């Protein structure tokens, strides 16, 4: 189907405790495949998936070099942003960046990304046209002016249409055993009495990949969106994900409730009920 490659970066200053900590991770879809942590004993880009391990030593040297360089630029950027926002040097601040590309089933570029946040708030974002910028405030406008001057967007566009798509393609082939396999959810409904008058029906989805999933309850065919407790999709730790949805049900009305599951590992959407 469709696929994505994404690189995430976080720098966190810690005045009085050394230089800002830099952590970057790379993903294909929901599979972590590389990481770099400046606090590691001997910081290097490290493999986190079997299909990337075959890349040669020059690959790992290059990616390590790029990450170290990004850690350095983030550190001077954090000093710059203190100036832009008239902030003291006493506090801890955060710079986050994500970039990457989405491709369709034919491997063609669907769209690219490159966007920043400072202290958890949107800072500057490359627009979908891969040629213009959206700056969140007058500080980010200074970055925009600099990046327009240096034609940064044109560099990014070339990468996002070029290497990003080409290497995602390469990774998808080398890890086709896993990257191109969807694991459907294993599903069941459980029943937990609350009182003489009510019980909880909990619809479970377990062991699925990728993370995207739709879990809903209907009562008499009506969506129960407002009354459904829906937990965040969570990692199991073994590449797969978990999710549940729960409704509180008057006793004796269990059979009016149906759980509905959509997932790309399922040929057809599922319907399930409490089975006493």
């Amino acid at each position: 189907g469709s696929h994505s490659m994404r690189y995430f970066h976080t720098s966190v200053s810690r005045p009085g405790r050394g230089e800002p900590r830099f952590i970057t991770v790379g993903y294909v879809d929901d599979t972590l495949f590389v990481r770099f942590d400046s606090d590691a004993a001997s910081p290097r880009e490290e493999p986190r998936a079997p299909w990337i391990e075959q890349e040669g030593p020059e690959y790992w040297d290059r990616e390590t070099q790029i990450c170290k360089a990004k850690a350095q630029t983030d550190r001077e950027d954090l000093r710059t942003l203190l100036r832009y926002y008239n902030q003291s040097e006493a506090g801890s601040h955060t710079l986050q960046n994500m970039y990457g590309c989405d491709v369709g089933p034919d491997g063609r570029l669907l769209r690219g990304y490159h966007q920043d946040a400072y202290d958890g708030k949107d800072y500057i974002a490359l627009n979908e046209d891969l040629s213009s910028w959206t700056a969140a405030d007058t500080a980010a406008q200074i970055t925009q002016r600099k990046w327009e001057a240096a034609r940064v967007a044109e560099q990014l566009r070339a990468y996002l249409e070029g290497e990003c798509v080409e290497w995602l393609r390469r990774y998808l082939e080398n890890g086709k055993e896993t990257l191109q396999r969807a694991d459907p959810p294993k599903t069941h409904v459980t029943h937990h009495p609350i009182s003489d008058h009510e019980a909880t029906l909990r619809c479970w989805a377990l062991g699925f990949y990728p993370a995207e999933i739709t879990l809903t309850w209907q009562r008499d065919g009506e969506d129960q969106t407002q009354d459904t407790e829906l937990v965040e999709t969570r990692p199991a730790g073994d590449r797969t994900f978990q999710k549940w949805a729960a409704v509180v049900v008057p006793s004796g009305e269990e059979q009016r409730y149906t759980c509905h599951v959509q997932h790309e590992g399922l040929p057809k959407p599922l319907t399930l009920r409490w089975e006493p």
């Binding site: 630029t73 710059t80 970055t143 940064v152 560099q155 990468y159």
Partner: peptide, 10 residues
């Protein structure tokens, strides 16, 4: 593979 042009400062 990462974007590897010379990094541009904010």
């Amino acid at each position: 593979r990462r974007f590897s042009r010379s990094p541009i400062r904010r």
